[PDB]
Amino acid sequence: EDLIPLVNRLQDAFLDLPQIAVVGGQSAGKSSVLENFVGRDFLPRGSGIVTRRPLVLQLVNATTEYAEFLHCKGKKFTDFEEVRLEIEAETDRVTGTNKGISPVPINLRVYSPHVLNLTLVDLPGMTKVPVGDQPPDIEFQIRDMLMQFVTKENCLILAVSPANSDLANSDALKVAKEVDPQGQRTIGVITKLDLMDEGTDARDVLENKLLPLRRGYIGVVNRSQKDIDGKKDITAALAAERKFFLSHPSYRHLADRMGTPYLQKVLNQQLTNHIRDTLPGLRNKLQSQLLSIEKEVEEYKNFRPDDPARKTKALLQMVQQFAVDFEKRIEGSGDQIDTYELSGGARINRIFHERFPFELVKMEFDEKELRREISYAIKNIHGIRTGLFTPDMAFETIVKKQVKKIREPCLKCVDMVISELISTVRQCTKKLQQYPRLREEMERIVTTHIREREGRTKEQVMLLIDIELAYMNTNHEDFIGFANAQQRSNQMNKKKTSGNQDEILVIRKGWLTINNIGIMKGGSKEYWFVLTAENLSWYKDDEEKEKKYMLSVDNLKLRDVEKGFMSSKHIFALFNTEQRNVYKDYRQLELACETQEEVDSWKASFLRAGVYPERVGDKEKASETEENGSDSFMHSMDPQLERQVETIRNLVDSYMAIVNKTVRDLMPKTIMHLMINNTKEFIFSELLANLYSCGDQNTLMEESAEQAQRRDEMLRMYHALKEALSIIGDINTT
Amino acid sequence: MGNRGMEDLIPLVNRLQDAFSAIGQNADLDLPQIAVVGGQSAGKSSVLENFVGRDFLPRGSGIVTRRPLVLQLVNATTEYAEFLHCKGKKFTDFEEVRLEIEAETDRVTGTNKGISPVPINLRVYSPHVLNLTLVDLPGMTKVPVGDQPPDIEFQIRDMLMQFVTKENCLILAVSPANSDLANSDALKVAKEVDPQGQRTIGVITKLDLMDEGTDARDVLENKLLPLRRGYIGVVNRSQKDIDGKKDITAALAAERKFFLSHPSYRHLADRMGTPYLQKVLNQQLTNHIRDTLPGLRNKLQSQLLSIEKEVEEYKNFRPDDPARKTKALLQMVQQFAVDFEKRIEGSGDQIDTYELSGGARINRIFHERFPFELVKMEFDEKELRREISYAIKNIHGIRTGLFTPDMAFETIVKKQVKKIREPCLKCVDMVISELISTVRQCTKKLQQYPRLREEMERIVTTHIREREGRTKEQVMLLIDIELAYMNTNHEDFIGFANAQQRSNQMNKKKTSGNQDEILVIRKGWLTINNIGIMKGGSKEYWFVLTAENLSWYKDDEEKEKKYMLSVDNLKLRDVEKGFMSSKHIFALFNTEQRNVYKDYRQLELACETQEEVDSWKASFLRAGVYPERVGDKEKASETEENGSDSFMHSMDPQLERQVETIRNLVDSYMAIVNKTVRDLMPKTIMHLMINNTKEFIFSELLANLYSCGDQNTLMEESAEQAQRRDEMLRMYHALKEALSIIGDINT
Numbered sequence A: 001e002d003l004i005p006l007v008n009r010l011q012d013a014f015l016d017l018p019q020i021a022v023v024g025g026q027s028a029g030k031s032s033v034l035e036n037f038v039g040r041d042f043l044p045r046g047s048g049i050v051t052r053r054p055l056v057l058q059l060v061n062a063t064t065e066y067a068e069f070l071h072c073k074g075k076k077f078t079d080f081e082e083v084r085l086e087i088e089a090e091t092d093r094v095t096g097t098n099k100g101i102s103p104v105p106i107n108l109r110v111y112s113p114h115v116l117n118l119t120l121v122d123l124p125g126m127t128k129v130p131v132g133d134q135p136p137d138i139e140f141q142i143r144d145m146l147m148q149f150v151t152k153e154n155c156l157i158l159a160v161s162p163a164n165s166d167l168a169n170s171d172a173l174k175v176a177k178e179v180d181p182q183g184q185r186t187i188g189v190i191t192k193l194d195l196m197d198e199g200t201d202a203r204d205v206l207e208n209k210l211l212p213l214r215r216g217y218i219g220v221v222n223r224s225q226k227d228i229d230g231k232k233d234i235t236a237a238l239a240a241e242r243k244f245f246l247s248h249p250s251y252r253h254l255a256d257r258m259g260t261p262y263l264q265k266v267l268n269q270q271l272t273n274h275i276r277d278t279l280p281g282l283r284n285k286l287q288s289q290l291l292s293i294e295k296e297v298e299e300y301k302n303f304r305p306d307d308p309a310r311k312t313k314a315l316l317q318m319v320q321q322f323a324v325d326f327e328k329r330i331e332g333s334g335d336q337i338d339t340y341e342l343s344g345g346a347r348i349n350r351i352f353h354e355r356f357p358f359e360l361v362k363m364e365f366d367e368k369e370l371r372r373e374i375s376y377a378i379k380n381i382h383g384i385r386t387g388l389f390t391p392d393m394a395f396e397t398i399v400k401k402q403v404k405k406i407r408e409p410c411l412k413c414v415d416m417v418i419s420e421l422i423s424t425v426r427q428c429t430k431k432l433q434q435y436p437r438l439r440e441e442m443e444r445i446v447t448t449h450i451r452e453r454e455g456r457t458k459e460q461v462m463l464l465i466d467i468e469l470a471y472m473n474t475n476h477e478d479f480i481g482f483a484n485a486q487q488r489s490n491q492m493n494k495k496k497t498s499g500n501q502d503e504i505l506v507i508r509k510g511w512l513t514i515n516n517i518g519i520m521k522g523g524s525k526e527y528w529f530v531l532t533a534e535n536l537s538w539y540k541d542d543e544e545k546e547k548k549y550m551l552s553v554d555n556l557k558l559r560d561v562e563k564g565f566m567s568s569k570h571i572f573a574l575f576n577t578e579q580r581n582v583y584k585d586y587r588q589l590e591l592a593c594e595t596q597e598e599v600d601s602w603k604a605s606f607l608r609a610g611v612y613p614e615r616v617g618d619k620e621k622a623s624e625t626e627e628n629g630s631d632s633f634m635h636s637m638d639p640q641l642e643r644q645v646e647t648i649r650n651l652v653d654s655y656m657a658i659v660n661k662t663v664r665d666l667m668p669k670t671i672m673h674l675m676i677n678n679t680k681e682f683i684f685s686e687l688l689a690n691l692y693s694c695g696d697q698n699t700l701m702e703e704s705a706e707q708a709q710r711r712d713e714m715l716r717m718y719h720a721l722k723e724a725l726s727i728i729g730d731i732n733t734t
Numbered sequence B: 001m002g003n004r005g006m007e008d009l010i011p012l013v014n015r016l017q018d019a020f021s022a023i024g025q026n027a028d029l030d031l032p033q034i035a036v037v038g039g040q041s042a043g044k045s046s047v048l049e050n051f052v053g054r055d056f057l058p059r060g061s062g063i064v065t066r067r068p069l070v071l072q073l074v075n076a077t078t079e080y081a082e083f084l085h086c087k088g089k090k091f092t093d094f095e096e097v098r099l100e101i102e103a104e105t106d107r108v109t110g111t112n113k114g115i116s117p118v119p120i121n122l123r124v125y126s127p128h129v130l131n132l133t134l135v136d137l138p139g140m141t142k143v144p145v146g147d148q149p150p151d152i153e154f155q156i157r158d159m160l161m162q163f164v165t166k167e168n169c170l171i172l173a174v175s176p177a178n179s180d181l182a183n184s185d186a187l188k189v190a191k192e193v194d195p196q197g198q199r200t201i202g203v204i205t206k207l208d209l210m211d212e213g214t215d216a217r218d219v220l221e222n223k224l225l226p227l228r229r230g231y232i233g234v235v236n237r238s239q240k241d242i243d244g245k246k247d248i249t250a251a252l253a254a255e256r257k258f259f260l261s262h263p264s265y266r267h268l269a270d271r272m273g274t275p276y277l278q279k280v281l282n283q284q285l286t287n288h289i290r291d292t293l294p295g296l297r298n299k300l301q302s303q304l305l306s307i308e309k310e311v312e313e314y315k316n317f318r319p320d321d322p323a324r325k326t327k328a329l330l331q332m333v334q335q336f337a338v339d340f341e342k343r344i345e346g347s348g349d350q351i352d353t354y355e356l357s358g359g360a361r362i363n364r365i366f367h368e369r370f371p372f373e374l375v376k377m378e379f380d381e382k383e384l385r386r387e388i389s390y391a392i393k394n395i396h397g398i399r400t401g402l403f404t405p406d407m408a409f410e411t412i413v414k415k416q417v418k419k420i421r422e423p424c425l426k427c428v429d430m431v432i433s434e435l436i437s438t439v440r441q442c443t444k445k446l447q448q449y450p451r452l453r454e455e456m457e458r459i460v461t462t463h464i465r466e467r468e469g470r471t472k473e474q475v476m477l478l479i480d481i482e483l484a485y486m487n488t489n490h491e492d493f494i495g496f497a498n499a500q501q502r503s504n505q506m507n508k509k510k511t512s513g514n515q516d517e518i519l520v521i522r523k524g525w526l527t528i529n530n531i532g533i534m535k536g537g538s539k540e541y542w543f544v545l546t547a548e549n550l551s552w553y554k555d556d557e558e559k560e561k562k563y564m565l566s567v568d569n570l571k572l573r574d575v576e577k578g579f580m581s582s583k584h585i586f587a588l589f590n591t592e593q594r595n596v597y598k599d600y601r602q603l604e605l606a607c608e609t610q611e612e613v614d615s616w617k618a619s620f621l622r623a624g625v626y627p628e629r630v631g632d633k634e635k636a637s638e639t640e641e642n643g644s645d646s647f648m649h650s651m652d653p654q655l656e657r658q659v660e661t662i663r664n665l666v667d668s669y670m671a672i673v674n675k676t677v678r679d680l681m682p683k684t685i686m687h688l689m690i691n692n693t694k695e696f697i698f699s700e701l702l703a704n705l706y707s708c709g710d711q712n713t714l715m716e717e718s719a720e721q722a723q724r725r726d727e728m729l730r731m732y733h734a735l736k737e738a739l740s741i742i743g744d745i746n747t
C-alpha cells in the first residue's frame, strides 16, 4: 500500500496504470475473481450464462464510496445491490432475455477512498456451441470481441481457469499464449479448488509444473451457488478460504501464496512495477510546480497575525511597486510595455497635449463683426480729434479682445488631463493592492494631491494668458506695420533701379479667375497674378518661373460684362480704344472676383496704378482730353478706413498666429511642471510618510478574506506536494 | 456386468447375417461403429467399458488415453483377447490386458504426455457379443503440455475426423457436468459432423461432482441444447474408487441410489443410469437393422427377378430323361436354322451391323465379282482376223463365193465361247468354299453342346460337298448348250446393218438414231493458233474430225453445238517462213471460193509431235481433203474431192470388208452370250446349291440328327454350362430362403 497513498496524494494535489482484463471460459468464475479484487459484491454472478456483455469498470479515488453509470446520469448509487440490478437490467434490455450477447460495453465508474485509477474489464465467457438464440458463429464473435480488448499492450490478463476441468482444456490459457507468448503480462488464476474429484489435487498445477507460466498460478476459492443464495458475506468466505488452504494436506505448504489476498498483493506488485520508469517525469513535473509556490509560502509559513514586521515590510514593498508602476506607466520606462492599448496615461495624455490645438482651431474665426468693431475702435480713439495717422491703440484693443476668449480652451485642457490622470492611478491600484483600506486610502491621498495641484495649474494658466494681454510686443517675427502685402521683397533685395526684371513685378499677388481662354492654353482657370503699379505678370504655380509675357498697366481701360451674367464673382474686362494693346484680349480679357469688397479693392489698385475708372461718361474722354480735374471722382470711394480696416485685420491675424503658437507650445510645459512632475515627486518622497499618518493605522492592511482563503489553499497544496515527493522517494527506495 | 440386451440381440442378427452370407452375395448388415468423443478427462473410457461390461481400458487423472483403441468384438465360443501386434498370444484376465495396453501406449508415445495417431487393435472373442467396432479416442485439448507439438489440437481433431466423419458411426458425445454445456467440445464436433442429429447420443458424466446448489435438470430434460436422441446421465467410479479398486455391483448400486435419492432426479431415475444407456445403444442398433432391411428386401426382389427368367425353364429337372434331350434337339436345330437363315437370306432379327459380312454380302458380291473375270481373264485380238480370213477361203475352198459364208461365223464363235468353261467352274468352287465357311461360322455359337457341333457340321458339309458335283455338272451343261444352235434371230443386228460401219452401235441407242449426229469419228487434241475474241484466245481445243464434218469443243459436256465445219472442197498448206514447226501447224483454205470460214489471219491448227501431224493429215486425206501437191494453185478443176483413200493402198481382195463384217457379228454375239451367262449362272447356283441347302437345313436336318445314335451320347456337358445351371439353382434357393428370413424378421 504505497501506491495507494501515492495516488490519493496525486488527487489531493489536483499515472497510466495498465488496465486489467479477466478472460476464461464460461462459468469459470471470472466475475467473482474480479469483484473480490475490487472488494465489494456488485457483479452479476450465477449458474449458466450470466456476464453476457462487456463491462468496463473504472475505479477512481474520492472521499466517499458509491457508483455511477454513463446512461443513468446523475444518479449516484450508494447501495451496490441496486448497482447489480441496474447492470442486469441494462444487459437484458440490450441483449434480450434469451441468452444473447452484445459487443457494446457497459461503462461504470466506482468511487472509493483507497483504490487505484484502474480499468478492470469483465468479459463474457468463451463458448463452443451456441445455445439459446445465439448466432451460429458465437465462438468467433466472443473471441473477436475480447481480442479487441486484450491484444493491446499494457493490459494485464488474469487467465481464470477452473480446477474441475483439466488445465489443458482451458480457453484463457490459449488466449493468453496467443496474445502474450512470453508471459510478460499474464497472471494465472485457478478457481474452484474445492470441487475436485475425491483423490486428486491441483498440486502439479499450482506449483507451476504442469504448464510452465512465467509468473505462476494463484489458487483461490470463491463462494458456491448455495453461498450466493444463502447470502454469505465476504468475510466468512475469506475465512473459509484460509481454513481450506491451511487444512488441505496437498496445499498446506503453499498456503502463503494461495488465496485472494495474495492475488491482490501480486496485482499491486505488477502495477507498482509498471508505474516506475514513469517516476522521473512524474516527480519532475510536480517538483517544477513546487518551485513556483516555495517562493511564496515562505511568507505564509509562520503567522501569527498582528505582527508589526510583516505588516511594515508589506507596506514598504507595496509602496515601492506602486511608485515604480506609476513612473513606468506615465513616462514609459522599460521593460515589458503594454502593446494592446495606447498606454495607461502616457499616450492618452500626450494625445491631449496635441489635441488641445484642435480645441483652439474650433473657435472662432469670426466674423464680419470683427471688421465692423475695429472700425468703431478707429473712430472712437479719434473721439473729437480726427485724421492721420492710423492709431495703434485700436490694434492693442482688438488683440486684447480676441485672445481674451482663449481662457476657455486652456482651462478645458487641464480638466481633460485631470480626468485622464486621476484614472491612471486608479488603473495601477485596482490590480496591485488587494489589501482593503490600503487601496482606497492610497487612492484618496494621491487623488487629493492631484486635486490640490489642479488649482495651482489653473491659476498659472490664468496668469499666463493674462500676461499676453499686457505688453503686446511688435518686435517678434511678425512683419512691421505698413508691410501689406509682403513688403518689401526683403527690403527690395538691395536693388530697385536697374532691375527691370529684378522683382519689380511683385507688389500685390492674388488669385483671379479668367473666363475666356484660348484653345492653345487650356480651359477656365483662376491664375495667380502679380500686380504692379507699372507692370503685371501671371503665374500658374508658386515656383515663380513662368515669366512668359509682361502685361501692361498704363493706358488701359475697364468695362463690365453684359447683363444677365452671374457676377458674384464679379467679372470685369480690359480694353483699349486707340490701340489694340490689351494685350491678347480673349473676347474679352476678363477677371473674376469672389466677394464684393475685392472688386473695389482691385479697382482702387488700378486707379492708383494708373488705370482709368469705369465711369459711363469716361469713354468720351478715352485718351483725348484726359484728367479734367477728375470730375467723376468724389474723393473718394471709400475714405479712408477700408484700407485701414484691412491693415489692422492683417496685423491682428499675424499677432493671433504667433500668440496661438506660443500658448499652444507653452501650456503643455506649464501643466507638466506644476502637475505631472510635482505629482511624481509627491508620490515618491511623501506618499509613505503621509500614509503613515491617516487612519488608526492598526486596522490598515488587513484581510481581504479572499487572500486568507487563497493563502490557506496554497499552503495546503504545499504540504500535499511535499507529501507526494516523500511518497515518490519511498517508492523508489523499495 | 452385462451386457444382456446384446445377449438377447445376438441370435436373430446372427441368423440374419449367415442368411445374407450363405446366399453368397456381397451383402452385409454393417453394424454401425461406436465412437466416443469429448474433451480431456470427460469420463469417456468409463462410459465405454460400462457399455461393454468388462474392465479393460486405462483411466485415471490427467492424460491417459494417448493412442486410439479399435476394439473389435467378435462372436465366438472361446472368450479371450488378442492384439494385432501380439499375434499368437491369448489373454484370459483383463487386468493383464489393461496393464500391457498402457505398457504399449507409453512404449510407443513415451512417458512425457505424448500422443500418436497409430491405433491399438484389440479383438475380444466372446459368446455374448456382436460383431461391432468400438473406437475409443483421446480427448481433445487446446494447449500443448509436456512434449506435445504446438499443433496438438489440430492433429487430435484430425485423429477424430478420420473416425467420426464416416457414415453410420454412432457418436457418444460425452460431456462432464462440472463444466457448462456450451463448453462441451463433443457437442461442437457432433454439430460439425452430424448437423441433423441422426446418430448422436448425448451422455452426461460426473453428475455427483456438480457444484453444491445446482443441478443439470435443464440439460437432462433435453431442454438446454435440443438433441434428437436426448441425454443420458451416468455416474462412474471416482478416482479414489479406482485407487480403492471398487467392483461393478457396488458402483451400479451407488448410481441407482444416487438417482433415486436426489430430489431433482427422482422422476428421471428410469431414463437415467448406465443400464438405460446400454439399452438405448442396443435399441439404436436394432433400429438400424430394421431400418436397413427394406432396401435389401427390394434389392433381393430386383435381383431374383432376373434369375427367375431362366429358372422358369429349369423348374422341373429329372436327369436324364429323353424329354430334355429331345427339347434340346429342337432348340439347337431351330436356333441353327434361323441363324443360317439370318446369315444368308437376311431375315431378322438383329442383323450384324459391325461386320460387313455376313454371307449374303460376300456371296452376292462374288456374283458381281465373277463378271469381272470373264472380261479380264480371256482376251485375244489382231490374230482372229487371220483365222477369219482362212475360214472364208477354206469353207468354200474349191470355188470362189459371191456371198459371205456363215460357217466362218459359227466356227469362230464356237471356238471362242468354249473358253468360258473355266470361269464358271471357278466361281462355283469359290461359292462352295465361302458357303462352307458360313456354315462353320454359324455353329461356333453352338459350342454349348460338344459332339453336336461335329455332327451338325459333318452333316451339312457332306450335303454341300454332295451337291457341288451336281451343280458343276449343271453349269458345264449350261455353257455347253450355247455351242449347239447359235441363233441369230435375237436382238442383235442382222447382217449388213452398218454401212459404213458402225456409227458406234447406232449411237448406242435406238431413240437417238436421228436426233444425234455422226460428228464423232476421230477424237483428239488439236491447237488453234490465231483465235478471235468470241471463240477464246491462243488455245488447244478438242477436235472431233469426221469423214463428213468437223467439230471443236472446249470441254466434254457436249452442249455447245456451235458449228458444223465442212470436209469436202478444202485445201491444206503449211505456215510461212520463220516458224519452227515441230509442233507443225496446218491451214485449211479454198482457192475457187473464199469459204474458210472466218479466217482470223489466219485459220491455223497446230499439232504437238510428228506422229500427230502426219496422223491428222492422214485423217484429212482419208476424209477427202486435197493434198499438198505442187499443183496446189491449179486445184480448180483437176481434183474433184481428192485423197486416194478408198479402201487401202493399193489393191487387195475383198476379204477386208468381209472380215470386218464377221468381226462385228462375232463381237455382238459374244456380248449377248455374256449377258446370258452372267444373268443365268448365279440363278443356277442359287437354285441348286443354296436353296436346296436351305431346304435341307429347314426340313431334313432334324431327322438326320435324330437318326444317328446314340441320342444320349450326342448331347452332353460341356461341364461349364452344367456348373452355370447349378449356380443358378443355388442362387434361386438361397434368395428364396433369404426372402423368408427377412419376412420372418419383419414381424
Ligand SMILES: Nc1nc2c(ncn2[C@@H]2O[C@H](COP(=O)(O)OP(=O)(O)CP(=O)(O)O)[C@@H](O)[C@H]2O)c(=O)[nH]1
Pocket: A025, A026, A027, A028, A029, A030, A031, A032, A033, A044, A045, A046, A047, A048, A049, A050, A051, A052, A123, A124, A125, A126, A191, A192, A193, A194, A195, A220, A221, A222, A223, A224, A225, A228, B211, B212
Ligand atoms: N463450489 C465453488 N463454486 C464456485 C467457486 N468459485 C466460483 N464458484 C461458483 O461458480 C458459479 C459461477 O461463478 P461466476 O464468476 O459468476 O461465473 P461467470 O464467469 O461470471 C459466467 P459468465 O461470465 O460466462 O457469464 C458461481 O455460482 C459460483 O458460485 C468455488 O470456489 N467453489
Ligand SMILES: Nc1nc2c(ncn2[C@@H]2O[C@H](COP(=O)(O)OP(=O)(O)CP(=O)(O)O)[C@@H](O)[C@H]2O)c(=O)[nH]1
Pocket: A197, A198, B039, B040, B041, B042, B043, B044, B045, B046, B047, B058, B059, B060, B061, B062, B063, B064, B065, B066, B137, B138, B139, B140, B205, B206, B207, B208, B209, B234, B235, B236, B237, B238, B239, B240, B242
Ligand atoms: N466421481 C466421478 N468421477 C468420474 C466420473 N466419471 C469419470 N470420472 C473420473 O474421471 C477420471 C478419468 O476419467 P476417464 O473416463 O478416464 O476420462 P478420459 O477421457 O478417458 C482421459 P483421456 O483423455 O486420456 O481419454 C477418473 O479418475 C474417473 O474416476 C464420475 O462420474 N464420477
Ligand SMILES: [Mg+2]
Pocket: A030, A031, A044, A050, A051, A052, A123, A124
Ligand atoms: Mg460472468
Ligand SMILES: [Mg+2]
Pocket: B044, B045, B058, B059, B064, B065
Ligand atoms: Mg480414456
